[PDB]
C-alpha cells in the first residue's frame, strides 16, 4: 500500500543518511586531541549565594552587561539580582506561579517568563512610574513553555510542550513563524551567536537545526538514548552540546552532521538538566540530578572538576558573556556564583 | 557612593515585601488535581487558552490551592516534576480504563521526584459501580482473574443497604491500589483510599482531614519520632 511504500522508502533515505555520515567519519575527535596537553585539575569556589527565593528555581539568564541577572522560581516571583553587590534590584510578581523558564533581553529593557500557563509575558523594566509592569502577553501555544530567547527588543523565540517552536513579534501579539517536525516535547533551545539559526532539544532524543527567517529545519541530529533536557551552542556557533536523561552528554557538529564526542562515566547514572559552555568552549559545565555539577573537557572528554555546593538538584546554570563567572540554579531555592 | 546607598535602600524595601509574601506562601496548602480521563475530576471542581486552572477555597481557616492541568498533552513525564513540593496529589479513579489508572498510580508512586509526595486516592463513580455489579452485564473476573479468589477483608465497614456483591467488588479495586502502595515508599509517603461520589459535599472535608495527617507525619519525621 501507499503507507507501507512510504515507510519502505523512508528506510532507504535513512540508510543513505547513515551511509553519508559514515563516510565523513574518517577520524574521531579522540585521536585528534590525543596529543594535546591535559586541561589539568581546575577549582571553583562559591563566591556568592543569592538567597531570597521562596521555592525551587527552574531557570536563570545572565544579562548582556554580565552584572544584572534574572532568576525564575516556582513560588510566583521574578527577581533581578545585582551579582556584584548581592543586592536585589527588582521583584516582579507573576500571575501564574508555575513558570518554568525566563530570559533577559540583550538591551536589558525587558524580561520574559513562561511555564504551565502556556503564555509568555514580557515585563517593561524601564517604565515611567518605576514599578515593573507587564507589556505583552503572548498566547497561542498549546503546551507548557519550556524555553524562551530574545532576538531583539521586538522579537522573541519560544519553545513549548506541543512539539512546536514559534517566533513572536512584540506589539502585535501574533506569532510570525512556526517550527514543526518534532515528535516529543521541546525542553530547551539555544541561539547561535549569528542569530540566523538556532537549535532545540526535544523528548524524541533528536536535535533539529532551524532557520529563523525561513522557518525550515536544516539538519536533524540523532544518537541520544533518552529525552534531551538541555542544549547550548558552541561559542563559535558551528557546534552545540546536548544533555539527556541517559547520563551522557554529546557534542554535535553542524558541518559534520554527526556526533563528535560523548561524555560518560560509570559512576554517573543520573541525567543532565542544564548544559552551558565556557568563554573559549574548552570546558563544558553540565548539571546533574545527584546535586553536583561536573565540568567536562570538551576536547578530551576527561572530567576536570566537580561543583558540590547545592543541597538539591541543579535545574539551571549559565555563564556570563565575558566568562568571568558561572552561576548555577538549584531546587534548594539558592543561587550560587562559582568562580 | 550615593547610588550604592540607594541600591541598599531599594534592596531593603524589597526584603520587606518578600517577608510579607513569605507568610502567605506557607499559609496555603497547594494541591494537585490529577484525575484520570472520564473520571469525574471536572465535577469535583465545579461543585467545590489557559494551560492551568486554579481554585482557592478555605476550610477551617486554612488556605488551600487546588490546580487542575488542562490544555497540556498526555505526556505527563515532564511537567509532573514541577508538582514535587505540593502538600498532596488528588488522584481520581473512575470505578480497560481501570488498568490504565493503576499503571499511572504505580509510576507516580515509584517516581524519583514524587517519592516524598503523598497521594490522596478518590474512588469516584461509586453509584455507577453499584448498578453495574447488580446488573451483571460486565464481569470483573474477565478483566481481573484474581477477583475469583478474593475475599472481603475484616476491616471493611459497609454502609447500610449495601449488598455483599458490590462491597467485595469496590474493596477489590481499592486493594489493587494498596498493593502498589504497600510495595514501595518505605515511610516517605502514604496513600489514603476514599470512596467518593461526584455530588458529595464531604470531599472538601476529606481533603482537609487528609492534609492534617500529612503535615502531622511530616512534623514527626523532623523530630525523628515517627
Amino acid at each position, epitope marked *: 500500500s501507499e503507507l507501507d511504500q512510504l515507510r519502505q522508502e523512508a528506510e532507504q533515505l535513512k540508510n543513505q543518511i547513515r551511509d553519508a555520515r559514515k563516510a565523513c567519519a574518517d577520524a574521531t575527535l579522540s585521536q585528534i586531541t590525543n596529543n594535546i596537553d591535559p586541561v589539568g585539575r581546575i577549582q571553583m569556589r562559591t563566591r556568592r549565594t543569592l538567597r531570597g527565593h521562596l521555592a525551587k528555581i527552574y531557570a536563570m539568564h545572565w544579562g548582556t552587561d554580565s552584572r544584572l541577572l534574572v532568576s525564575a522560581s516556582q513560588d510566583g516571583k521574578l527577581i533581578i539580582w545585582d551579582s556584584y553587590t548581592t543586592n536585589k534590584v527588582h521583584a516582579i510578581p507573576l500571575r501564574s506561579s508555575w513558570v518554568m523558564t525566563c530570559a533577559y533581553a540583550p538591551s536589558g529593557n525587558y524580561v520574559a517568563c513562561g511555564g504551565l500557563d502556556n503564555i509568555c509575558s514580557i515585563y517593561n523594566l524601564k517604565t515611567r512610574e518605576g514599578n515593573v509592569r507587564v507589556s505583552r502577553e503572548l498566547a497561542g501555544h498549546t503546551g507548557y513553555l519550556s524555553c524562551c530567547r530574545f532576538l531583539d527588543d521586538n522579537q522573541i523565540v519560544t519553545s513549548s510542550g506541543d512539539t512546536t517552536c514559534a517566533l513572536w513579534d512584540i506589539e502585535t501579539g501574533q506569532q510570525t513563524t512556526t517550527f514543526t517536525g518534532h515528535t516529543g516535547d521541546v525542553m530547551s533551545l539555544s541561539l547561535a551567536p549569528d542569530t540566523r539559526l538556532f537549535v532545540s532539544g526535544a523528548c524524541d*532524543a533528536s536535535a533539529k537545526l532551524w532557520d529563523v527567517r525561513e522557518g525550515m529545519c536544516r539538519q536533524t541530529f540523532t544518537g541520544h538514548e533518552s529525552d534531551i533536557n538541555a542544549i547550548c551552542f558552541f561559542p563559535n556557533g558551528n557546534a552545540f552540546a546536548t544533555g539527556s536523561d541517559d547520563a551522557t552528554c554529546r557534542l554535535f557538529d553542524l558541518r559534520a552532521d554527526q556526533e563528535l564526542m560523548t561524555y560518560s562515566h560509570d559512576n554517573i547514572i543520573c541525567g543532565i538538566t542544564s548544559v552551558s559552555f565556557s568563554k573559549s568552549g574548552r570546558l563544558l559545565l553540565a548539571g546533574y540530578d545527584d546535586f553536583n555539577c561536573n565540568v567536562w573537557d570538551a576536547l578530551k572528554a576527561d572530567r576536570a572538576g566537580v561543583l558540590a555546593g547545592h543541597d538539591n538538584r541543579v535545574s539551571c546554570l549559565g555563564v556570563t558573556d565575558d566568562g568571568m563567572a558561572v552561576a548555577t540554579g538549584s531546587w534548594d531555592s539558592f543561587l550560587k556564583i562559582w568562580n | 557612593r550615593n547610588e550604592e546607598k540607594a541600591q541598599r535602600e531599594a534592596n531593603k524595601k524589597i526584603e520587606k515585601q518578600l517577608q510579607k509574601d513569605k507568610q502567605v506562601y506557607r499559609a496555603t496548602h497547594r494541591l494537585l488535581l490529577l484525575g484520570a480521563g472520564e473520571s469525574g475530576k471536572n465535577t469535583i471542581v465545579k461543585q467545590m487558552t489557559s494551560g492551568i486552572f486554579e481554585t482557592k477555597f478555605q476550610v477551617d481557616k486554612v488556605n488551600f490551592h487546588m490546580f487542575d492541568v488542562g490544555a497540556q498533552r498526555d505526556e505527563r513525564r515532564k511537567w509532573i516534576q514541577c508538582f514535587n513540593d505540593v502538600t498532596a496529589i488528588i488522584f481520581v479513579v473512575a470505578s480497560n480504563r481501570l*488498568q490504565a489508572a493503576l*499503571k499511572l498510580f504505580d509510576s507516580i*508512586w515509584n517516581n524519583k521526584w514524587l517519592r516524598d509526595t503523598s497521594v490522596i486516592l478518590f474512588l469516584n463513580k461509586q453509584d455507577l459501580l453499584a448498578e453495574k455489579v447488580l446488573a451483571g452485564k460486565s464481569k470483573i473476573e474477565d478483566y481481573f482473574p484474581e477477583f475469583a479468589r478474593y475475599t472481603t477483608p475484616e476491616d471493611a465497614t459497609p454502609e447500610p443497604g449495601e449488598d455483599p456483591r458490590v462491597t467485595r467488588a469496590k474493596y477489590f479495586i481499592r486493594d489493587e491500589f494498596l498493593r502498589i502502595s504497600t510495595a514501595s515508599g518505605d515511610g516517605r509517603h502514604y496513600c489514603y483510599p476514599h470512596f467518593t461520589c461526584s455530588v458529595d459535599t464531604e470531599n472538601i472535608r476529606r481533603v482537609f482531614n487528609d492534609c492534617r495527617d500529612i503535615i502531622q507525619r511530616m512534623h514527626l519525621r523532623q523530630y525523628e519520632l515517627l
Partner: nanobody, 128 residues
Framework: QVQLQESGGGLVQPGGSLRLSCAAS????????MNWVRQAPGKGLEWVSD????????SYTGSVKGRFTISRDNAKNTLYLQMNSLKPEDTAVYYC?????????????????????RGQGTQVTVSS
C-alpha cells in the same frame, strides 16, 4: 537513533498460537524496561505486559494473565512474547514500548497517542 522493529503475527485460526519478536537497536537493551502495548481498531492503546531489566519482575494484564508469556534476551537485544490459546477478541496491532528513562522504576507515557520510543507494530488477526 532509537529503533524498535517488530515481527511475527498474521492470520491465525482461533485457539492457535503466535510469537512476536521486537528487535532492539540504538540503545543498551540490558538496562531498559520493556512494555507491550496493543491497539485494536476503533479504540485506543492498552497495556499488555512488562518485563524488568533482569526479568525478575514479570506482570501481565488481566486478560492475558494465564495465556501470554513475556521473555527477553539481553545478549541478542530482542524481546519475545509467547502467545498461547488465542481468542478472536485478541486481534490488534502489537507494539513493543521502551521505558522513557534508564534505571527508572516508573515508566510514563507508555500508552500515549504519540510516543517517540515506539516502533511500527505488526497486525495480528485471529479469525476463522
Amino acid at each position: 537513533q532509537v529503533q524498535l522493529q517488530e515481527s511475527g503475527g498474521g492470520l491465525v485460526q482461533p485457539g492457535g498460537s503466535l510469537r512476536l519478536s521486537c528487535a532492539a537497536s540504538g540503545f543498551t537493551f540490558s538496562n531498559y524496561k520493556m512494555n507491550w502495548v496493543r491497539q485494536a481498531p476503533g479504540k485506543g492503546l492498552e497495556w499488555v505486559s512488562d518485563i524488568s531489566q533482569s526479568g525478575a519482575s514479570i506482570s501481565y494484564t488481566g486478560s492475558v494473565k494465564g495465556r501470554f508469556t513475556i521473555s527477553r534476551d539481553n545478549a541478542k537485544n530482542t524481546l519475545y512474547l509467547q502467545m498461547n490459546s488465542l481468542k478472536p477478541e485478541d486481534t490488534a496491532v502489537y507494539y513493543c514500548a521502551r521505558c522513557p528513562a534508564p534505571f527508572t522504576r516508573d515508566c510514563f507515557d507508555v500508552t500515549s497517542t504519540t510516543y517517540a520510543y515506539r516502533g511500527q507494530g505488526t497486525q495480528v488477526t485471529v479469525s476463522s
